[PDB]
Amino acid sequence: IANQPVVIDNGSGVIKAGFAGDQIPKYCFPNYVGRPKHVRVMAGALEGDIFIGPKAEEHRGLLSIRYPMEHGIVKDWNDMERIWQYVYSKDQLQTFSEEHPVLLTEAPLNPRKNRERAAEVFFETFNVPALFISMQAVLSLYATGRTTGVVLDSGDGVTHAVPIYEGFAMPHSIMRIDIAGR
Amino acid sequence: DPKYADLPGIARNEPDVYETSDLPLEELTSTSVEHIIVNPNAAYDKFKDKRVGTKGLDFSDRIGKTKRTGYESGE
């Protein structure tokens, strides 16, 4: 038995999400963790000590924003656990991680520890039935419907190019520099 | 009463009381502020079920951690 898989598209600055078979990523939010700077005094204030999502944007002046994924490499695994749980929270997907396959996206030429720790997270914390980490160039080719092309993307923290001709990728002509939007 | 007969100078026809005729906010209605009617019942019902966790807090000038944010938990 299998269900509709979840496309947890990562990003160094914006993390997209949404179920498969859709046409619009219905749940997009910035990939940052906001925790309060000031001191809570009143009784009936905001509660949680960690704010991710549109709530963080709603209270930017109260939170100390910090990005956990720098240049495509996850720097804070605990914060990423919070972010992925927020993806499966009751505000973005309202589902369980044990009932859906995950299509995670990674930038090319990433360190192996990112893939291994992502595997341990999605298979030890989230009890996901199936995970498939894919690239980012091939996906844009799928989105445009083409079969050939030089995907030149530029995320928030990684700009890279992966030339693909007739559905075949060339793993030696992949350039990648850590100079982008952020 | 008997102080009239026994004493010489205690006169009568004396008006004992000589007197006179006993003759017989707008700052809250401003257009600048928005006057609010305080209701303790509505406010009490609003903050009725909001807890405050005071587990290991501080407010003094103690510098051991990075920051200091008291009143952590709730309900």
From Swiss-Prot, chain A:
Keyword Nuclease applies: no
Q: Which UniProt keywords apply?
A: Acetylation, ATP-binding, Cytoplasm, Cytoskeleton, Nucleotide-binding
Gene Ontology terms, MF aspect: ATP binding
Coiled-coil boundaries: none
Q: What are the GO cellular component annotations?
A: cell cortex; centrosome; dynactin complex
- Indicate where this protein resides in the cell: Cytoplasm, Cytoskeleton; Cytoplasm, Cytoskeleton, Microtubule organizing center, Centrosome; Cytoplasm, Cell cortex
Q: What does this protein do?
A: Part of the ACTR1A/ACTB filament around which the dynactin complex is built. The dynactin multiprotein complex activates the molecular motor dynein for ultra-processive transport along microtubules.
Q: How does it assemble?
A: Part of the ACTR1A/ACTB filament around which the dynactin complex is built. The filament contains 8 copies of ACTR1A and 1 ACTB. Interacts with dynein and adapters such as BICD2. Interacts with BCCIP (isoform 2/alpha).
Q: Which family does it belong to?
A: Belongs to the actin family. ARP1 subfamily.
Q: What is this protein called?
A: Alpha-centractin
From Swiss-Prot, chain B:
Modification Phosphoserine, positions: S73
Modified-residue entries (Phosphotyrosine), positions: Y4
The source's superkingdom equals Eukaryota
Q: Where is this region: Disordered?
A: 1-23
Q: Which residues form the signal peptide?
A: none
The cysteines joined by S-S bonds are: none
Q: Cellular location of this protein?
A: Cytoplasm, Cytoskeleton; Cytoplasm, Cytoskeleton, Microtubule organizing center, Centrosome; Membrane
Under the subunit heading, UniProt states: Subunit of dynactin, a multiprotein complex part of a tripartite complex with dynein and a adapter, such as BICDL1, BICD2 or HOOK3. The dynactin complex is built around ACTR1A/ACTB filament and consists of an actin-related filament composed of a shoulder domain, a pointed end and a barbed end. Its length is defined by its flexible shoulder domain. The soulder is composed of 2 DCTN1 subunits, 4 DCTN2 and 2 DCTN3. The 4 DCNT2 (via N-terminus) bind the ACTR1A filament and act as molecular rulers to determine the length.
Protein family per UniProt: Belongs to the dynactin subunit 2 family.
Q: Tell me the function of this protein.
A: Part of the dynactin complex that activates the molecular motor dynein for ultra-processive transport along microtubules. In the dynactin soulder domain, binds the ACTR1A filament and acts as a molecular ruler to determine the length. Modulates cytoplasmic dynein binding to an organelle, and plays a role in prometaphase chromosome alignment and spindle organization during mitosis. Involved in anchoring microtubules to centrosomes. May play a role in synapse formation during brain development.
Q: What is this protein called?
A: Dynactin subunit 2
- Which species is this UniProt entry from? Sus scrofa (Pig)
Gene name tied to this protein: DCTN2
Q: Which residues of the full protein are shown?
A: 3 to 87 of 405
